[PDB]
Amino acid sequence: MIKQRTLKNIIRATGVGLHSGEKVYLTLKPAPVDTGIVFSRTDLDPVVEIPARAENVGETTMSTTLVKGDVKVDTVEHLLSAMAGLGIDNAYVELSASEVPIMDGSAGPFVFLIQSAGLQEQEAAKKFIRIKREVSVEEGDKRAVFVPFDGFKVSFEIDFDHPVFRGRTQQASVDFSSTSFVKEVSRARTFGFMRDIEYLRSQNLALGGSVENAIVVDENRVLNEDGLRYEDEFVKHKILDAIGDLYLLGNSLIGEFRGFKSGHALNNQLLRTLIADKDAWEVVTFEDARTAPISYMR
């Protein structure tokens, strides 16, 4: 059978919050079967735990934020993307502050931490959510869709008209049958438009942001000296973001996500909308791994 997995060891890193600029301690820990991913604010007294589930998502304007009452964990998407890509079912994530460290702006440092901690197979069947019927949400010209697919695929299109984006592909469709999340998606850095970053900074926001953790573009050029890690790094990051947001379903997906200029808000709306309609999905397991359309071989 395809088994659930967790980490073999506890592992740690430090960084700064993108929004807050606040130095933060991060800890990843193994967790028992059927735990899912659980975030814990260890700085608070008492310690506050927030399961990484769609129903716990609060604000989604800049990043995906988990909330429990007045307590938040901000910017969970890049870490969750790594958890999803490596097929980690169960883990505890401890934080000393209200935001996951931005690290290098991608999911790479988290893939690094997870792989370094080691992967532990557990004695329980891994559960998958299979899309049975196409479900969509939109807001204006933005659209997010789940489509049935015998495997796992993420497609995305962005549509920027700024000169800096002219001629760029602005589209990608990744079938993970033959694409490596680690090698071809995970290291895609977040990006920001200079005008927007200036506005945030003017309000004392985005304090942790720098060219060392984000691709910065003005109307016309990429400001980063070294260019891009992937030729299509911008759309690859949108795909990364979607994979992280999608993992709030609590299980790996058998199906396709299609995004069109979509963001965390639409992503979460899509999740809640899917979850609510029981005719559009089912939970499946695989007693024989070679019968599965998906593989988390390592």
Ligand SMILES: Nc1ccc(C#CC#Cc2ccc(C(=O)N[C@@H](Cc3cnc[nH]3)C(=O)NO)cc2)cc1
């Ligand atoms: N000298 C100097 C100093 C500081 C800086 C800087 C900076 C920065 C930044 C920044 C802020 C917000 C975002 C963000 O919203 N990115 C989105 C996705 C997204 C949404 N809209 C655009 N992108 C995202 O990846 N969410 O997961 C990303 C980056 C630059 C130069």
Ligand SMILES: [Zn+2]
């Ligand atoms: Zn423009």
Ligand SMILES: [Zn+2]
């Ligand atoms: Zn992102």
Ligand SMILES: [Zn+2]
């Ligand atoms: Zn909703």
